Amino acid sequence: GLVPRGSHMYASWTASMSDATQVLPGAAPAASQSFNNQTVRHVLRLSLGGNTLRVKVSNLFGKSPITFTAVRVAKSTGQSNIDVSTDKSVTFNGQASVTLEAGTELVSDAVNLEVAPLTNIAVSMYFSSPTAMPTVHALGVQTAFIGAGNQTAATSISAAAADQSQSYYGLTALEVSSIQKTNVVVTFGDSITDGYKSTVDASKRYPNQLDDRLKTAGFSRIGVVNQGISGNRWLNDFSGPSGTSRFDRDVLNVTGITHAIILLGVNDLGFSAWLAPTQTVTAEQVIAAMTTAIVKAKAKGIKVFVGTIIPFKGASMGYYYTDAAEAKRQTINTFIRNSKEIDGVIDFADALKNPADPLTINPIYDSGDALHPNDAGYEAMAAAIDLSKLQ
Incomplete structure (x- = not known):
């Protein structure tokens, strides 16, 4: 019959987090990557579609708080490009900016963006301040795009190709709602x-x-x-x-x-x-x-x-x-x-x-x-x- 209409969130994409500064016994210390008035545009493939989504960000291995000045989502059209008509603000208790204490993670408010399975979305994060980001998924097997200033809503990331990465920075899950x-x-x-x-x-x-x-x-x-x-x-x-x-x-x-x-x-x-x-x-x-x-x-x-x-x-x-x-x-x-x-x-x-x-x-x-x-x-x-x- 009619599927009961109660909606629920499901993990559609995840990335396990690691501490980029941790090293083997006896090894020299390792420095974390840092951002300073820059945007990182990640691209990820959704396993599950649905009607709304939310973004889980992480400072799990930070040694100091980090502030996500802005987080946005959009459908990806390849490389760093997005479909700007699908660009949405990602908020946290209604706020566009959010601070995570060291050792914490946080899932966003629901975003009204309808998405399909096995499609790519871009999750873009702006860090206005000097931001150490030891909390990473180190080997993403996926290109991320880094540019100066707040480019979270830009059609593409304007930057040098050397400002690309294959890691995920403080981005650990993306959940999508469905009644099914x-x-x-x-x-x-x-x-x-x-x-x-x-x-x-x-x-x-x-x-x-x-x-x-x-x-x-x-x-x-x-x-x-x-x-x-x-x-x-x-x-x-x-x-x-x-x-x-x-x-x-x-x-x-x-x-x-x-x-x-x-x-x-x-x-x-x-x-x-x-x-x-x-x-x-x-x-x-x-x-x-x-x-x-x-x-x-x-x-x-x-x-x-x-x-x-x-x-x-x-x-x-x-x-x-x-x-x-x-x-x-x-x-x-x-x-x-x-x-x-x-x-x-x-x-x-x-x-x-x-x-x-x-x-x-x-x-x-x-x-x-x-x-x-x-x-x-x-x-x-x-x-x-x-x-x-x-x-």
Whole structure:
């Protein structure tokens, strides 16, 4: 009959936040990016359409407050260009400017802009004052455009091409309202979820390609949002807050989450040979972290799927991949494949392994570093997922 008319917000796009100033033990300090009377125009692909939207901004890892002098949204027409007829002010309790204390995040008022699934919008932020922005999504696989002054409502960003970035600055979710029954699938993981080595500005991350399959099958109301962080580990900070510490924020608290696909751990194994030798962890310690995350998500009624760790022999041999890392990978994958607690396994390892040698990634899917898939490998990851799982 008539769908009940109650409207609700759903996460349509997400980006997990990291602290750009955090470094490995023993490393030299790292400086954050800063803006000073400048506008950053981000571009993002919506998984879910609807009638209104709201923007979640973040100062989660700031050391001082930041003030967003203006935030605006518009439909993207490619590169930095917008459809000015769709430009809208984004307000916060009715105010165009808003200050976030260090360690806080904030979702905006609803914006009356009707949007369609798998379309790009631009979210533009003006910082009038000197603004340190350590709170980033570091590897966005998407161009952002930076210009002088308040260009948030401009048709395009007038600036030098060297003033482009591929990060997201203090922008962490974009939620869209609908009266329809809606599923939200959160892909949680590291660079292989984030989409490192997929084509920039092409929406070829594995969760994008999974989203394409869903919409092609007719499921416009099953959304896929990306909570990957390139370099992320279950058990230790860097890159990004540890998987265990961020699971509540980046999975359990995603608006409308119904399903999660967890793919994490290869960096726990690979970082200890050389990047972080004081942070050697066992497969059993990784499994314990995974267990607590699974328990928490199931307690909230979320469907929990766990992916097997894809083969990575050849990835900086002796300095990332090691025999110890392979042994731990085996133990973890055996645990995943035999677990009675998870709702299902997604055997990415089986899907992407080399038929000629199961310890290596299939050469046709290898970006070149023996660890990260290329676009075809991310397509193969998405193709391996039974869409019945996401219903």
